[PDB]
Structure formats: structure tokens, C-alpha cells
Structure 1
């Protein structure tokens, strides 16, 4: 409805690292549910298992902790112990080669997952099409 349907080649079979090209950070969920970006390729909290719920709809789960990436009503990204509506993301291809993650619940507002150059995760409303912060590369673990 609100977005295009260009999809990235499949990437759920194996766990992946979600590399943000903006500042070169790996998405990370700390045990306390804190979400940020880290440049430390040796972190034990940057590995995720993605799975398709519906074509183009995914869940992003931390393999270390089992926490699910989610986005709250206020646009803040957090780690959810259990899967819910806030955990569904629209996985799309962007600029022909990257992956973008749009909050399903907030799809009409174009709220995305994105990381600033300083490694801080962005609030939903601060993100938008055209930004570098929303571009991810799923890398092998």
C-alpha cells in the first residue's frame, strides 16, 4: 500500500550482520534491550536471525539474546523479549543494492530503522527515504 515491492535476494537461511553504511556500524541489541550501532566486529550482540512472516515482512532476532528488534509508538527502537506488532518490518531493496527496514506498524509514516554516523539509532520520525542511515548490507557472520 504505502511502499514499493522491490525485494532483496533472500537472507534468512543463515544469521547475518546488519551493517549500516552510514557510519559503518553493525546493528546491536544489548541484553537490556538497548539498541545501537557498533563498529566492533567482535561484539557478541551484532548477530541476527531474520525470518519471513509474510513475503517482504520480517522479524529480526538477536541470536545471542533471542530479543526481537522492535519500534515503539514513539518511534524508539528497542529489543522485545516477545514478538509483537512492533516487531514486524518491511524488508526492502534500496538504491538497487541495500536493504531497508520499515516499521510495519508505522509504515504510513515512513519510519525506518537507521543509524547515525555517531552510532546512535534514529527515532522513527527522524528517518526518511533518501537518507544514508537507512541503508544496510546483510553480511555473513
Structure 2
């Protein structure tokens, strides 16, 4: 598995069993492990290894987890930023994943937002 870490806040992305998505700085957290899997040729899915839920950015900017594999809002493009950092962009809505300092997670189209930069790391 990999971890998905907000570089600006040090928070790891977490999909909880209840379907909510938030951030935590707890490395022993049982729900921060992800599998990145191919979707067709150019996209990926971001899947919780412990729960089997895929990360979803909804059109309204909310972010949650779903096991609905037909969902069109679970596909992401990973874009390099330089310095081992990446952006995680939902292809359907053009929104970047953001972890806010308060631990909430949502989407934004603002590419200049500092809170959308991630580091992917093997755990």
C-alpha cells in the first residue's frame, strides 16, 4: 500500500468505514493505506486497502468513499508537480483533492491552492 500525504499540512488522507473522508496525522491509523489501480490506460482509482472503498469527488465539491464501481467520479489523474509532489485531479469534474488544515477533505478547481499538493509514499 501507499500513503497519500498533504505536504502543506502533514495530514494523511483517510477513508473511514462509514464512508466519510478526512485527514489525520496519525501514522498508526488503520485507515490511511491506499492501493492505486489502473482504470483503462491513463487514469487511476484510489482505493482504501482496509475497506475496499474508492475515493470520490462529487460535483458539489464534497469528497467521500464508495464501493460503487460504476461511479464516474472515482477516476483520477495523477499530475507531477516537481519535488516528489503530485496533484490528484478527478477527471469527471476537473477538481483537485484538497485536505484543509481542520482535517476536512474536499475538491477545488483552484490549481494554485497550496492545500492540493500531495506526496505519495510506500508504507
What TM-score, normalized to structure 2?
Answer: 0.91
User: Partners in 1 of 2:34 and 2:24 — Cα distance?
Assistant: 14
2:122 aligned residue:
140
Give the structure with the larger strand fraction.
2
User: Partners in 1 of 2:9 and 2:66 — Cα distance?
Assistant: 25
| Misfit runs of 4+, over 2 Å | none
Per-residue displacement from partner, 1:19-66 (whole Å, max 9, x unpaired)?
111210000000011000000000110000001213441100000000
User: Partners in 2 of 1:132 and 1:119 — Cα distance?
Assistant: 15
User: Partners in 2 of 1:37 and 1:112 — Cα distance?
Assistant: 15
Per-residue displacement from partner, 1:76-96 (whole Å, max 9, x unpaired)?
110001222110011111145
Report how far residue 97 of structure 1 moved. 2.7
Per-residue displacement from partner, 1:80-134 (whole Å, max 9, x unpaired)?
0122211001111114531111111112xxx110101222113x24x51122211
Q: Across the two proteins, how many residue pairs are aligned to each other?
A: 122
Q: CA separation of 1:120/1:73 partners in 2, compared to 1, >3 Å: closer, same or farther?
A: same
Q: Summarize the alignment of residues 64-103 of structure 1 with structure 2, pairs less than 5 Å apart.
A: 64-83=50-69, 84-103=71-90
RMSD, matched Cα = 1.4
User: Partners in 1 of 2:112 and 2:80 — Cα distance?
Assistant: 13
What TM-score, normalized to structure 1?
Answer: 0.80
- Give the SS at the match of 1:86: coil
User: Partners in 2 of 1:54 and 1:97 — Cα distance?
Assistant: 24
Gap regions ≥5 residues in structure 2: none
Gap regions ≥5 residues in structure 1: 1-14
User: Partners in 1 of 2:99 and 2:82 — Cα distance?
Assistant: 17
